[PDB]
Amino acid sequence: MIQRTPKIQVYSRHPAENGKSNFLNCYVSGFHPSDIEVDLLKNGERIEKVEHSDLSFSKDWSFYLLYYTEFTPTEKDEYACRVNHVTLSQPKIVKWDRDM
Template identity: 60%
Template sequence: MARLFLFAVLGQLFILPYLDAITSSPKVQVYSRHPPDSDKENFMNCYVSGFHPPQITIELFKDGKKIEKVEESDLSFSNDWTFNRLVSAPFDPKSKNDYTCKVTHSTLQLPKVVKWDPENN
């Protein structure tokens, strides 16, 4: 009985904190590298964080059409064993185009779509 109690306590101390990381939904932030009114060449960034398992699809769109030439960072992870990734593409923030980031992950019933908003950049 004492062994069972000890196992339960050790499980709560050492295993349970990592069970949350087994499935964790992604958080999505879409922003430009430079201020929208800057004259510098700009990039739309889609930063996806806090997800587990690591298999994820991140796509960028311009007016509903997939942007094919994107840069994708290496997959990295945080202290809590969740993962992070940055996907970016050149864009013109002064244009009237709609830019979105679509994230597909096993923890989501439907893909998460986040629109770039110059007002909240």
């Protein structure tokens, strides 16, 4: 069966400023089939209050999903997104890098 690997991006809606509320995004695109597990992490722990967009797909039939939560960045706090999918031998963790 066709299988396509998710491309994973973790980023903030607005430029990060310590102390200012923002939105943390994990965008997964280009994957197939549609079953996928996405978790936003704060210092390694699963963030429970996470919304996600309605399942949709691109012109090449691959799926995309946005997971997002409100957050206020700090200097010590590490954020990441952890994604599991049939194409991944183990869950992939992408760390949020604000200096990109």
